[PDB]
């Protein structure tokens, strides 16, 4: 239900309503953390 509709490329984390792209890793705010993806 928590639907994200933005992605942000940056070296510092963006707002939690977006995904976090940084040089080979993407991260989304899950369980009060930025959960990487494998």
């Amino acid at each position: 239900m928590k639907t994200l509709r933005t992605l942000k490329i940056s070296p510092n984390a963006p707002d939690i309503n977006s995904v976090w792209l940084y040089k080979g890793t993407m991260k989304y705010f899950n369980n009060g953390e930025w959960e990487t993806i494998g």
Binding site: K8, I9, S10, P11, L21, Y22, K23
Partner: protein, 333 residues
């Protein structure tokens, strides 16, 4: 040039140093003349037209007498070492316009409110090393600055192959990529240039500059792509063109102020300064004071010049003579 005077300044060239008034045959000979009492001092000079003598110096009214070396009067050409800052990236970033802006403050005018901006551009590609980037940037800088079309010289671009960190590989709008066969280029030196000079109408000026960089998106953030740092200069502009305009000005005190003005009705002054040589200088400041109510001083400047062989042999013997003659103890630079 025009200078500020402390009520007067005279110049005398010392081409050859003699020991007598009788040996003055050639137009640059000079003698420091004083009496055993060490109460006055004057110089007997050989002019294009006969002997002349300078105003007499009262050796009790000398304010200062210091000989400057030729090195002191050579304008050092400030040079930067331009690189790309390893914090943004140690290598070019493809698809980004690596622009470089060079600002010029004292452009044709003489104020700091008369600025001029010339640019250098390089768009990076994958597999582009740093040497390739510097090559391409120096080339784009030359084509815009060291061209056969710009009214004035602005900069001297160079390249340095890290294998030889001393030699400054030059670059001009004629230079082409293939003429630069090295792969260890690590900086783009940018040095100010000697501007054109003509005796008595165009003072020896320089156009100072600062390299301003621009932004590039590296990981989503607009960041500056390079760092410009000044390094100890290595090319100096001698004083030949400077002493020469000094003479041109200080010879209209002894002589004609109507220089070339009414062209055929003129007094043509013959000058002894070579604008392709390197002179030391010896300036002596003194004054005249009157009698019992005219105690006001009249400070008057007199300066002497002499070519430099690298060891200041001409001026050293010159003042050694003046010291044997006047008791003064000027220092032999």
């Amino acid at each position: 040039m025009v200078i500020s005077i402390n009520q007067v300044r005279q110049l005398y060239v010392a081409k050859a140093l003699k020991a007598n008034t009788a040996a003055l045959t050639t137009a640059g000979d000079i003698v420091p003349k004083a009496d055993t009492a060490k109460t006055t001092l004057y110089f007997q000079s050989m002019s294009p037209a006969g002997i002349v003598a300078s105003d007499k110096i009262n050796l009790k009214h000398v304010l200062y007498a210091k000989a400057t070396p030729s090195e002191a009067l050579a304008h050092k050409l400030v040079r930067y070492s331009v690189t790309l800052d390893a914090d943004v990236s140690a290598t070019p970033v493809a698809g980004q316009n690596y622009i470089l802006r060079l600002a010029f403050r004292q452009y044709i005018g003489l104020s700091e409110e008369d600025q001029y901006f010339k640019y250098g551009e390089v768009i990076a590609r994958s597999g582009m090393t740093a040497s390739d980037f510097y090559k391409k940037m120096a080339i784009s800088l030359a084509k815009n600055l060291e061209n056969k079309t710009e009214s004035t010289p602005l900069v001297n671009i160079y390249l340095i192959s890290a294998a030889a960190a001393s030699t400054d590989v030059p670059v001009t709008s004629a230079t082409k990529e293939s003429d630069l066969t090295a792969t260890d280029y690590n900086q783009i030196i940018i040095e100010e240039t000697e501007q054109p000079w003509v005796l008595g109408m165009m003072p020896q000026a320089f156009i100072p500059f600062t390299p301003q960089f621009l932004t590039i998106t590296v990981d989503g953030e607009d960041r500056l792509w390079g760092v410009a740092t000044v390094v100890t200069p290595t090319k100096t502009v001698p004083d030949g063109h400077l002493i020469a305009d000094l003479e041109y000005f200080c010879m209209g005190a002894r002589g004609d102020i109507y220089r070339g003005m009414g062209y055929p009705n003129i007094i043509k002054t013959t000058y002894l300064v070579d604008p392709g040589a390197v002179y030391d200088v010896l300036d002596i400041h003194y004054f005249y004071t009157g009698s019992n109510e005219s105690v006001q001083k009249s400070e008057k400047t007199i300066t002497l010049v002499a070519v430099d062989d690298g060891s200041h042999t001409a001026m050293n013997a010159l003042i050694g003579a003046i010291n044997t003659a006047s008791g003064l103890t000027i220092a032999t630079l």
